[model samples]
Target chain A: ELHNDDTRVVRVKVIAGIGLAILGASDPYVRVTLYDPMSGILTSVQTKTIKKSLNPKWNEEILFRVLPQRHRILFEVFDENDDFLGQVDVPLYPLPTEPYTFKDFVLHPRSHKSRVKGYLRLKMTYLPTHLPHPP
Target chain B: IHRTQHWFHGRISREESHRIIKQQGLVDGLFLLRDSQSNPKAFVLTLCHHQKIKNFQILPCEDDGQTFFSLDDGNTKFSDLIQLVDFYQLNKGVLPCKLKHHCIRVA
Candidate 1:
């Protein structure tokens, strides 16, 4: 297991940033940050970039990592040029039972025993105008 | 690219059209990605099959059950893809087309 038992699957990074206009653009980067929150930690992380990407698509993916336990993950996106764009910090205060989506992309909730490998899909929506605003 | 040339935007029977997809941009399922090889006149590196790993499992990355037409089979056509720049400055590496031309050309 990449992580440990004490580490409850916290968050799941879903969609990577995409090039608008393109069918399913290359959304390959994921923003990993401190669980607490520290802005400006954007890097075009990840190896395989999805060829097809639609803003406001489904949960980035169903099975990101394929291990035996869930993992706490963080996510964000960058422009095509690999520049820090923004963080997908969903403000679902109190925490919901299941994973929900914001604009377009759907994020995953840490499940029981993270048992996946590689990358996990995330919730992505290209509102361009909206931020992770709290309601 | 050659996949949906039958009914897709690749209706252009012009040999040049075939040349575009076969030479410039090859299709990747429903998306028009770039071609690994530039042109037949440019270079002839290796006789390797110009094949790419296609994406299956169509999943929308954003909006409306939505955003992106999951590459039904990790394969779009050549003509289906539009260019993303002026003839001089094209972002050939990335999604270069803009929506401003949505009216002129259907994306």
Candidate 2:
């Protein structure tokens, strides 16, 4: 959902952890994968590689949102050869949890005072594939 | 008040949405059903500009509307939300205070 008012909103933050394995590893990359287990189709949302700290850090601010069916948040740590060193699974963040929305604020400020928020975008919905029976 | 200082540096439990409030030095009201679709349902709470909220849902009581909880106040602590829930004859078995702690089934 979006925000109610524009001013005085405590932006939505994408919080992540920094582990030695994630930083020390080589060619580490993270991606948000979306899938419909029933449909048998798969999709991958790409993300940029963090190049700062040994354990690169990332952040973003946005009007929070949710997805449908099942979505996967994967944090994959790779080696210089692009081999998997470690990985973590992000849980399903139900939609109703976002405290602020776009109406409340923008993705960071126009000036360099602050940076932009970096989070994935998603959307999906499902029907029974059939109508409900009458009483 | 028993406060367990998390030593392992792990994130606090979702039930303990307290540290956020403590930083602002607030002691917490409102049953703010977030008008925004993204937020959908929740409370608009504050302790002098501090974040102290406890959301409320008004679906049906435990006994199918035999009781109803009026979420009139601004907000309440997670600890007290259930009591209010039970008071209005609503469901109370779904929360951290019960799952983590324990609950006594009333006869």
Candidate 3:
């Protein structure tokens, strides 16, 4: 049987980014991917490239339908040329009951040889389905 | 010569397809394609850029006795809609790119 409530939504607010480096970097952008265990699918989303800004502010909400279980959200930063800048993975286990803000998250490079390129600030809001109204 | 626009077999009105692509345009800089309608065969591709919502018409085709869906009108073709979107994301074609200052939505 499939427990399809269809109302469970989670909102991710990408606040600000800091200290990103790339060769001949001119523009930067972020890609977010959420892995849903129930569907066994990875929901990938992208943000527009902010031209020539290592520290960019992307206050946006990304919504997703999630069941009452564990999940993982991945973030990768890239340059205009689609070069990898940094990446980080956030877990959604023990699902938050209230609003939470992540001041800073270290983003490591995709290549093992490189060091931490930067940190990303984000806000997570859990919008439960059963609630009378969404948060 | 050779055909350019991609075509597939499926069903979607011209108007409905346009609506989805425009929905995601640039408040936070995002665009995506997701399942649309009850057909499971139908899909909606959306993008938000320059503080605007724009939808792309996913061309559905019926050939012989098969149904297929595509984003290209013959300019390109893919096995599925996802491939079409993935292609556009990396390479700029008819569809606009979010990187340009013209696509930035300052809201």
Candidate 4:
């Protein structure tokens, strides 16, 4: 019988933001969420807001478990006013067992009115839930 | 001095180091070293044990006009970060677990 390894803990480090302000330096934070294929529901976790800076460093760590091949992680950036700044999608299937660092993930604007806002620095690691830890 | 080692990720933040260790596997003794953010002159040893990441600061100590590195204030000493790592790998000393696996980047 094959062991079940479908569900794994996905650890994400939302490192920082670069060139995010559109006007008067928008306070920025990142929201990470994903939809479950079975339940069709969205669960989210976010970083603390950095005040009045174009380049913000949150250095926040986020962790969750999911079936990697069946889901994607959504990273959305927002201002203090709760307005959408930009977003990017990271597909989980292609992620390797080793840690991968995303140097500058370009954020896509929400509408035609706004230009490409900025970039995000992220580090992701995937660990099997049932994997053995050393004694 | 240990900057050339594969386990040394210079100038990376604590959170980034944690991600690397977790990605490699949360198994005990996985570790890496990075330049300390708060103390520029010091370094940090980031390690995993019992599925949790712990950071121990490697501070610089002065003795006989030579500088050495120590994690336990000044009790144990080594010439550099690499030497310190080597010592810990063979001996657990004060760490919760000995260093087993080291996190590395391909490019």
- What lDDT does each candidate get? 0.27, 0.28, 0.55, 0.74
Off by over 4 Å in 1: A1-7, A11-28, A37-47, A51-74, A91-93, A98-135, B1-107
Candidate 3 lDDT, B1-107, residue by residue in tens: 00111222123443443443344333533554444554454555555656565666556565445444555463333434533543454444456553222121111
At residue B38, give the lDDT of candidate 4: 91
Q: Rounded to one decimal, what is candidate 2's iRMSD?
A: 22.1
| Tens-place lDDT digits, model 4, residues B1-107 | 46557677788888888888888888899998888999979999999999999999999866667577788765456656755775577556579998998887423
Candidate DockQ scores, in order? 0.01, 0.01, 0.05, 0.02
Encode model 4's per-residue lDDT on A1-135: one tens digit a residue. Answer: 122366666667889888884365678888776555554323445577888887899987755555688867788888876777789887777665653556689999878876557898888877543322211
By DockQ, who's the top model here? 3
Q: Is candidate 1 or candidate 4 better by DockQ?
A: 4
Deviation in Å, model 4, residue B1 alpha carbon: 56
lDDT of 2 by residue, B1-107 (tens): 10111111122232333343344343322111111122333322211122344433422222232332224331111222232322222112222121111111111
lDDT of 2 by residue, A1-135 (tens): 122232121123333324423334344344433333443212222234555333444443212122332533343443334444344444334333222332111122234443323322222112114322211
**Which scores greater on TM-score, model 1 or model 2?**
2
Return the candidate ranking by lDDT, descending.
Answer: 4, 3, 2, 1
TM-score of 1: 0.24
lDDT, candidate 2, at B101: 14
Q: How does model 4 score on DockQ?
A: 0.02
lDDT of model 3 at residue A106? 83
Native interface contacts retained, candidate 2: 0.00
